[PDB]
């Protein structure tokens, strides 16, 4: 079952076993490859493993399955921030903020904190 594999992947993430968790989200994908959350969860694994190219590919797969995904736009913004595409990264982080507000999701100050990091980096490069 893809949901059981997603939950196992979640337990491995909490135990800081990121490649093991990504492999488990891959098993969930094999069982049902039409669920955006598995790609988003694996993209997060890739960011922790510093594999932004593989994280980016998963964000695009997730956005094709769920255009309203807060986490997919957020993780996409983090990839673009790592690649120094500041304008695109800010736009994705801003979209993530907008979708979280619409969906009544509360991640504390995570999204505004991230936008502040991106705007600071955009200014440094323009200076």
């Amino acid at each position: 079952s893809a949901q059981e594999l997603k939950e196992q992947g979640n337990r491995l993430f909490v135990g800081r076993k990121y490649p093991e968790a990504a492999a488990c989200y891959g098993r969930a994908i094999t069982r049902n490859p039409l669920v955006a959350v598995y790609y988003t969860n694996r993209a997060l694994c890739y960011l922790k493993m510093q594999q932004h190219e593989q994280a980016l590919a998963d964000c695009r797969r997730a956005l094709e399955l769920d255009g309203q995904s807060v986490k997919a736009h957020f993780f996409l913004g983090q990839c673009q921030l790592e690649m120094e595409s500041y304008d695109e990264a800010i736009a994705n982080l801003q979209r993530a903020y907008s979708l979280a507000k619409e969906q009544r999701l509360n991640f504390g100050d995570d999204i505004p904190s991230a936008l502040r990091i991106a705007k600071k980096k955009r200014w440094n490069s323009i200076e």
């Binding site: 997603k6 959350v37 997060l44 986490k71 504390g108 995570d110 999204i111």
Partner: peptide
């Protein structure tokens, strides 16, 4: 509780 955005959904 894993309430941060840097957490997988689940």
């Amino acid at each position: 509780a894993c309430s941060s955005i840097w957490c997988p959904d689940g």
